[PDB]
Design a protein around this ligand. Structure first.
Ligand SMILES: COc1ccccc1CC(=O)N1C[C@H](C(N)=O)[C@@H](C(F)(F)F)C1
Ligand SMILES: [Zn+2]
Length: 139
């Protein structure tokens, strides 16, 4: 689990969005596993606007943060689930690191701010849904 709070927005994994998220929907993209809902309180997270390929993510299954090198956002094949059929997930960045399904929502950050959130894993890999291209999150 996990979310990003920036201005009047809440960013979460689309497969983990609640009834409240869907009733206050701003934007969602099934191909990215992202959903953004509106909030009444003002969020104070800073979104990174950069091309960093190094950062730190929080891994709930180990209660630890890990430094990682990660790939540029791209279309990557992802297996079937109770939420999606086998498809290409877009805007995804992979890194070598530990992840388990419950780790989705863990934040990846670089020196500039929030880069993305855990969305995929397995086989000693961890995949992050990028949010740096969502410029409207700041306005
Ligand atoms: C953190 O994910 C791990 C980690 C280890 C092992 C397995 C997983 C699960 C994984 O790869 N998923 C990809 C998928 C997707 N984003 O299309 C996610 C979900 F199904 F929508 F919830 C879950
Ligand atoms: Zn950066």
């Amino acid at each position: 689990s996990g979310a990003i709070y920036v201005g009047n927005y809440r960013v979460v994994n689309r497969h983990l969005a609640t009834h409240n998220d869907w009733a206050n929907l701003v934007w969602e993209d099934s191909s990215r596993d992202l959903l953004v809902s509106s909030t009444t309180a003002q969020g104070c997270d800073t979104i990174a606007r950069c091309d960093c390929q190094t950062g730190v993510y929080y891994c709930s299954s180990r209660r630890k943060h890990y430094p990682v090198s990660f790939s540029k956002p791209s279309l990557i094949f992802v297996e079937a689930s109770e939420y999606y059929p086998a498809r290409y997930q877009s805007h995804l960045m992979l890194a070598v690191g530990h992840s388990e399904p419950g780790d989705c929502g863990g934040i990846l950050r670089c020196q500039h701010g929030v880069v993305g959130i855990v969305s995929t894993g397995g086989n000693g890999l961890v995949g992050f849904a990028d949010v740096r291209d969502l410029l409207w999150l700041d306005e």
